[PDB]
């Protein structure tokens, strides 16, 4: 089988002490990450959520985001259900973005960009002003429409 985990990589140029595994950083850099040369890989996930009478609030936790990443989300009702409210907060509850109703008022959308070293996000959808809605979310995916 394959294996999974974290790793530490030390690269040297004309520095024979690297093969000992104890080389401290020195000199001027010579290599860089290759993935930075092309567009960031997108991730998209879709879910169906239902707001019962006693369950009019719904929260979901997201995976950690690296600095410079972007976040997008949108919600569209399955049928005649009214548009709910949407907002984005971190793990402590600090608000970060609020949903905007589109001019063809059938959907709500949200956008955010990452400033901190590690960001943990929470998506809030509430109808506490058998309704069912579709939740579409993406990371580095501006084409969610």
């Amino acid at each position: 089988t394959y294996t999974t985990g974290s790793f530490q990589l030390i690269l040297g140029l004309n520095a024979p002490q690297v093969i000992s595994g104890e080389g401290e950083p020195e000199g001027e850099v010579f290599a860089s990450l290759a993935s930075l040369e092309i567009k960031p890989e997108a991730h998209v996930q879709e879910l169906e959520i239902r707001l019962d009478k006693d369950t009019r609030y719904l929260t979901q936790h997201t995976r950690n985001l690296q600095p410079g990443d972007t976040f997008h989300a949108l919600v569209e009702p399955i049928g005649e259900a009214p548009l709910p409210r949407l907002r984005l907060t971190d793990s402590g509850g600090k608000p970060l973005a609020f949903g905007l109703i589109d001019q063809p008022g059938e959907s709500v959308e949200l956008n955010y960009t990452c400033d901190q070293d590690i960001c943990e996000l929470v998506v809030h959808v509430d109808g506490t002003d058998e309704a069912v809605y579709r939740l579409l979310v993406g990371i580095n995916a501006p084409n969610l429409r």
Binding site: Y57, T59, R87, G92, G93, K94, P95, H124, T128
Partner: peptide, 9 residues
């Protein structure tokens, strides 16, 4: 002015 809850706003 901040929010510090996840059950309600």
């Amino acid at each position: 002015i901040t929010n510090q809850r996840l059950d309600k706003f």
